[model samples]
Target: MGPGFDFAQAIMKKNTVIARTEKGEFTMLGVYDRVAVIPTHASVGEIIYINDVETRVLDACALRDLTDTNLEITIVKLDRNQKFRDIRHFLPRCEDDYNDAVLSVHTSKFPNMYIPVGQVTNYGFLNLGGTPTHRILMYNFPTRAGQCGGVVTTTGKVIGIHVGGNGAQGFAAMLLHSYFTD
Candidate 1:
């Protein structure tokens, strides 16, 4: 539907705006190839900063998550009507890649910085309720600054999100797809 070969922008597109939430502005990398449903605002774009000003609501598959974020994507179903991606091409369930213990990501403070394939250092189970059932692999660990909700990619494909670390190591949650609501 787009240039067809330019998914890099989609990879770089990185987020679908929360459109304006009850809290501060927020977004998630769960959407792939960024469908027309919503246009993302890239703080970083080729040649210049986008500043992501224009906004429009979209027809989306939806749900409520007590949680999910960078290094912590718990994908909820979008009514199961299906939105994007050809199943054969989208990144396969990372249970396959998790075995390899490596993934990629873009740091927030330095969007241009390349946080290379992070080795899944250890699984830090965060009680599956309020904490991130995520893992920590550090190249940089700071509980503050701009980098949470960033992408954790493997083989050039996204496999996780960058959640905050526990003052020990950096964390990234595995991206899981929820195809059903019931």
Candidate 2:
């Protein structure tokens, strides 16, 4: 419930496409379609799916489940190079305590992949100037290999995907909601 970016309006106005492969290696496409000029790091589109009582979408690294059932979503993939990357130069080290806590929580289910969320940084939201700044407590799990196309969200709306994360926060190559509007 922190200040969320206005995803609905942004996606509605921007021209976005959903890119996906049958094998699940997803990407964003049509990045420079309708907008006057696409931002260097602009997100193309997102892919979403339902999980348990929540709807989830994967963008960059983390998976977010919609706590509320208010948003609807679609899925798209782009060319491989269109995928998001870690803008940061150095990756932070993992926090032992935080990692243990996360393991204790998810060990019962995905025991083999019970990685502490601390293994990666959640990179998604940025500042007013469109630089990396904000961090959302989106999930309590870690991302795995080949999970790139995974989508994260709160409700049924598409948010981001499982890209990469530092030890402290999660990162997402946002399939900006704006692109979907068009």
Candidate 3:
């Protein structure tokens, strides 16, 4: 682990949502309700469903800074008359709450998802005056559509959502940490 942490011992229950896009596509997605303020680009009428919870994307937006990629996220509301069972809501993380975060995960098409099995590496600007996404980076990560919507956490609190990644680094959109607190 060059600079990563293994969360296999945390006894964490992963949140894997099946997102049905308007394009008639299905993608397994993550959650972003921890810290920071990463952005999400979702369209209205998009559907995200897991065990029992089903969400309808009401709106989506993006936040872009001078030298970084735009942070995108969606404003999702639970479907009324929808059952709430086996929901993967995690401990919340706030912007003011600093301590390092992001639970990097991996999965596949037929269907597989997990916490980062190796290490997480990213620029030091991670929690600084800072970089893109919400949390830090993890390697040996999966590059898929909607992968960034997963959970990002440190200790017991959820910090962000796995958003995007490159060759060896994965990113998460902050849990709208811009409006969070310690």
lDDT, ranked from best to worst: 3, 1, 2
Q: What is the lDDT of residue 87 in candidate 1?
A: 25
Worst 10 residues of 1 by lDDT: 41-50
The local distance difference test score of each candidate is 0.38, 0.29, 0.42
RMSD of each: 9.1, 15.7, 7.3
lDDT tens digits, residue span 38-62, model 1: 1122222112111334333233332
TM-scores of the models, in the order given: 0.48, 0.29, 0.49
lDDT of 2 by residue, 27-97 (tens): 23223321111112223334332121121233432222244221112233322323332211111232111
* Error in Å for residue 84 of model 1: 8.7
Candidate 1 off by > 4 Å? 1-10, 13-30, 33-51, 57-88, 94-109, 121-124, 127-144, 177-182
lDDT of 3 by residue, 1-182 (tens): 32224441232334334444443223333333421122244333544433335555443434544466544444444343432232234434333334444354333343434454234444323431243343344546555564545555555545555555664556555444343222
Clashes of each: 9, 46, 19
The residue ranges of model 2 lying beyond 4 angstroms of the native Cα positions read 1-24, 27-138, 167-170
For TM-score, candidate 2 versus 3, the one ahead is: 3
